[PDB]
C-alpha cells in the first residue's frame, strides 16, 4: 500500500488532537484500537507508527500492546514512538518498570528539555531524591547533546506541554538517553536511536503545547520521512471531481436534518450535478419547537430545487416508546425508526434502488468510531475533515452566517434530553421553553461563543426542567460556562412566569468529563 | 393596634417595624369579620398590603360592612399600598393599570402649595402637562425615599382627598384626609428600606396612640419565674438557637433526635450540647431505624411531614415516658409555655451576644422541621441519608471557609433521583428577605467552580450534580 503512520490508541482521548495536527501538518493518518493484531496492517507501506494511551498498569490486567505486534512494529528502520502510556507501555513491555505517580498535577506546563548543561539549568532537582547538586541525578540517568533531532528551532529551550499522568514510570527500558524533566514527575520522556524510540509521557497532543505541535511535525517530518502526504481538504475536492465528472448518469440521496455537517455536503455536492439528488426530511418527533420547517425552509432558500422531500411522522415515535426508561433502549428505537422511515420515503420514490449513493452528515469522528471499543456502496463526503474545518468550509460556502454557530443536536433529540413519560403535550411544553431560554440566551451573544446550550427535563412528577451549558474545546472535553446572573435572574424568572406547568429550575453545574452531553 | 392581612410579604415585616416602639397587635384575616372586634380598641388601623389588584379579581373584597364599622368606631385609620386601593374603592374613586410603574428605589417626593408649585415632575402626564403631614411631621425635611411596590396606579381618588405628595410616573403616591386620619401609601414604608417611612409609624403611631417589646417579655419571663414552682422544662432543646437561647436563660436560672442531622455534626452536636450544658440534660433518642424503615417505598407529601409529625409526637412521649412571633403571625392573619413573642429573631440575637454566647449561634441554617424529610427522593435508605449528609457538609464546608457562607441566609442540599449507577444534586442557595418570601443569591463562579469539582470528586451514587435558581416567589424553598 501507500499507507504512512499507525496511531494506537488505549483509551487516549486526546486521539482526535493526535490526528488533527498529523493533519493540519499535511499528514497522513490512520487508526486502529490497541489490542490491534497485525491482522489487519496490510503489508502496506508504514514508515512511522505512534502509540498513545492517557486512559493504572500497576493493576493486573491494564491495556497495552502484544508482543508480535511489538517486535514487529520494531523491525529497524521503521520507528516507534510512544507517548503518556504508550510510552509506559512502551516501557514495560521491554525491560522497564513502573510505579505511580504522586499527586502529578499536569497544566499548561512549561518543562524543560534536558541535556547536561541543563542538568543544571533545572532548578528542581531537589525533589525525588538527593541533596542539591543537580548534577546528582543526572549523574545517575543517561544524557547528551542540545540539538535532538526531534527538537529543532524552538526558539525557547523551554517546552510547555498540557499533561496528565497518574501514573509514571521509574527505569529506563533499555538504552535510550534523557530528553525531558517535570516538577513532580522525573524522568519523563527518553529518545531511543536504535531501536527509533521516543517516550513523552507529556501530552504533545494539544494546542496547549505549540511548542508541540512542532514536535509532532518534526517527529514524522525527521524520524520518519512521510515525503509525500495527503492533503484533506482536497479530499472532500477530488473525491468531487471525479463525481462531477459523471453527474447525470448518477443519481445521489442526502440526509438533511439541518446539521451543518448536512447543509454542506449537499451544497457542495450540488453544483453540476442538480437533479439527481433527494434530501429527504425525517421527523424526530423531537425538534426544536417548529425546527422542523425553519430547517426546510432553509434548504429551500439555499437552493430552490433538488428534489426536496419532506415526511412528517411524529406519533410513531412517541407510540413507540409510550413510558420507556431504557436509555440504550430509547437510541435503539430511535435509531430504528429513522432507518425505517428513511427506507420507506426513500422508496415512496419507487426506482433506481442500487444505483444511489446515500450521503450522511459525516466529517472525521464517526468515522473514526467506525473503529472503537438496502445497503449501497456507500459515498459519505466528509470523511477527513474536522468540525472546525468544515466551519470555515460554511463560510467558504459562503452560506448563512447563523448556520455555523449551530449546537449540532444529539439525534435522539428531545427524547433523551426528555427524560420521563416522553409524549406530545409535556414535550410541547419544554420545545418551547427551551426556546425561551435559548431565545434569551442568544440575545445578549452567547451563542455564537455558548458551544452548547439546551434546556434538558427533568419529570419531576408540577415539573422542573433543568437547563444545562458547556463550552466545547473538542469531541471528549465538555467544560461547563457560566452565565451572569443578571441574564440568569431574567430568563429563570421569564420561564417560571410565563410558561405553565414548571414550579422548579435547576441549572447544572458538572463538569468537564463527567461528559454527561446530554442526560441520558 | 389592628392590621388587616392581604399577603403582602412585608405585611410581616409591617409589624416588626412597628413593634420597635410601644405598639400593640391582634391579626386577621382578609374579612376580618366583626365578631372578631370587641371592648376591643386600638386608636389606628393598619392596611395590608397584596398583590391583588383591585379592578381584578382575587382583590380581597374588604367587608364593606365591617369597613362602615370601621368608621362607626371613631378612630384614626392608615392605609398602606394596596389597603390604599380596596380602599379608594370601597370609596367612589378607583384605580388603573400601571403608568410604567415599577418598585423600589423610586425617590417620591411631597407636596402642598409651595411644594406645589414645586413639582417638575408632572410631565407625560396626560400627553404633555405642567405643574408637614401627619405623615411627616419631622422628618419635615420635605420628601420623602422609600422602597415602593405598585403594580396599581391609582388614578382617581376617593372623595374630598387631597394629596400629601406626588411621584415620578406614579402621580397619585399619597393620599393625605381630614375626613377620618386617612392616608392610603402607595409606595411601601414597611420596609427597611423607609427611613422617613419609620417615622410614618411611630407619628401616625403615636397620633394612633392616645408596651415595648422586649420590655414585656423580659417582664413576663421574671413573674414566670416568681412562683418557681419550675421543674417542668419548657420544651426539649432540640438544639435550636431559639432553643438553645430560651433554654439557657431558662435553666440556667433554674434547676431530640435521630429524625434526621447531618453527620459527626451530629456526634458533634451531642457534644456541644455538653460543652452548653454544663449541668443539663442532653437526653437523645439515637433510635430512627424504625421510621426511615418506614420509609422504604413510601411517599405521601402532608403525609411525609405528618408522619414524622407523629413520629415527632412519638419522641415527645418517648423521652417524656423515662422522666418565636413570626411563626405565630403566620398563623394567626393565615386563618411548659412558649417562653415568649415579643421579639424577632435579629433582637434574639443581639440577645445572644448581649449573655455572652458562643459564636456560630447566628450563622447557622435550622432547617426546621422535617430534620430532612423533604429532601426525601421518596424511597428513605441509609445510603441516601448517609450520602446526602455528606455532600450537604461538603456544601457547608466550603462556604464556612470561604466566607461567604455567613454570608448565605440558607445553604444545603436536596437528594434528585432522576440522573453505572446513579443518583443526583441539587445545592440550594437562598438569601432570604423575609418569611412570606426568600430570593437566591449567586454565589461566584470561581469559587462554586470549585465547590463543584470538590463534590464530584469525594462519591458516586452522584452521577452530575445540579445548582438550583429559584426565588421566592415563584416556587419554595425548601425543594420538596
Known amino acids: 500500500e501507500y499507507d504512512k503512520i499507525l496511531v494506537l490508541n488505549f483509551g487516549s482521548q486526546y486521539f482526535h488532537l493526535i490526528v488533527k495536527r498529523l493533519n493540519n501538518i499535511k499528514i497522513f493518518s490512520e487508526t486502529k484500537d490497541y489490542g490491534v493484531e497485525l491482522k489487519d496492517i496490510k503489508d502496506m507501506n508504514i514508515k ?3 502509540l498513545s494511551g492517557g486512559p493504572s498498569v500497576t493493576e493486573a490486567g491494564s491495556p497495552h500492546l502484544k508482543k508480535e505486534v511489538f517486535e514487529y512494529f ?7 514512538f510512544g507517548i503518556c502510556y504508550g510510552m509506559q507501555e512502551i516501557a514495560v513491555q521491554m525491560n522497564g518498570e513502573v510505579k505511580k505517580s504522586k499527586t502529578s498535577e499536569y497544566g499548561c506546563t512549561d518543562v524543560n528539555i534536558l541535556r547536561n548543561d541543563n542538568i543544571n539549568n533545572i532548578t528542581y532537582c531537589r525533589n525525588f531524591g538527593d541533596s542539591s547538586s543537580a548534577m546528582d541525578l543526572y549523574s545517575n540517568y543517561k544524557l547528551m547533546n542540545e540539538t535532538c533531532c526531534l527538537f529543532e528551532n524552538i ?3 523551554i517546552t510547555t506541554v498540557w499533561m496528565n499522568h497518574n501514573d509514571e514510570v521509574t527505569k529506563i527500558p533499555e538504552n535510550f538517553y534523557l530528553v525531558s524533566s517535570s516538577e513532580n514527575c522525573l524522568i519523563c520522556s527518553i ?3 536504535e531501536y527509533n524510540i521516543y517516550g513523552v509521557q507529556y501530552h504533545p497532543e494539544v494546542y496547549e503545547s505549540l511548542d508541540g505541535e512542532l514536535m509532532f511535525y518534526n517527529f514524522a517530518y525527521n524520524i520518519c520521512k512521510c515525503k509525500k502526504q495527503f492533503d484533506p481538504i482536497r479530499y472532500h475536492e477530488l473525491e468531487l471531481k471525479n463525481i462531477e465528472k459523471y453527474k447525470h448518469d448518477h443519481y445521489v440521496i442526502a440526509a438533511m436534518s439541518g446539521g451543518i455537517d448536512s447543509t454542506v455536503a449537499a451544497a457542495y455536492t450540488h453544483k453540476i450535478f442538480k437533479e439527481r439528488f433527494f434530501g429527504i426530511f425525517i421527523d424526530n418527533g423531537l425538534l426544536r419547537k417548529n425546527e422542523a420547517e425553519n430547517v426546510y425552509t432553509f434548504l429551500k432558500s439555499t437552493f430552490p430545487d433538488m428534489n426536496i422531500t419532506k415526511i412528517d411522522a411524529s406519533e410513531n415515535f412517541l407510540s413507540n416508546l409510550q413510558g420507556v426508561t431504557d436509555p440504550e433502549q430509547k437510541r435503539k428505537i430511535i435509531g430504528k425508526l429513522f432507518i425505517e422511515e428513511f427506507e420507506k420515503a426513500v ?3 419507487d426506482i433506481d434502488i442500487n444505483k444511489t449513493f446515500l450521503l450522511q452528515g459525516t466529517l472525521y469522528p464517526d468515522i473514526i468510531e467506525s473503529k472503537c471499543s438496502l445497503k449501497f456502496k456507500l459515498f459519505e463526503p466528509f470523511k477527513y475533515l474536522f468540525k472546525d474545518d468544515v466551519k470555515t468550509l460554511s463560510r467558504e460556502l459562503n452560506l ?6 449551530r449546537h449540532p443536536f444529539p439525534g435522539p433529540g428531545l427524547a433523551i434530553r426528555v427524560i420521563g413519560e416522553i409524549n406530545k403535550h409535556k414535550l410541547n411544553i419544554l420545545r418551547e421553553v427551551d426556546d425561551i431560554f435559548i431565545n434569551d440566551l442568544k440575545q445578549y451573544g452567547l451563542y455564537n461563543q455558548i458551544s452548547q446550550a439546551f434546556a434538558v427535563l427533568l419529570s419531576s412528577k408540577d415539573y422542573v426542567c433543568v437547563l444545562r451549558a458547556v463550552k466545547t474545546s473538542s469531541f471528549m472535553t465538555a467544560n461547563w460556562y457560566q452565565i451572569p446572573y443578571d441574564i440568569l435572574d431574567k430568563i429563570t424568572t421569564r420561564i417560571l412566569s410565563e410558561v405553565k406547568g414548571v414550579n ?5 453545574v458538572s463538569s468537564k468529563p463527567p461528559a454527561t452531553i446530554e442526560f441520558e
Do not use: F, H, Q
Open 48 to 50: 512511522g507508527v505512534i
Open 74 to 80: 520494531l523491525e529497524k528502520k521503521i520507528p516507534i
Open 155 to 157: 526558539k525557547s529551550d
Open 191 to 193: 529518545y531511543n536511536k
Open 347 to 349: 422508496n415512496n420514490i
Open 400 to 405: 448563512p452566517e447563523e448556520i455555523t454557530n
Open 504 to 508: 422548579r429550575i435547576l441549572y447544572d
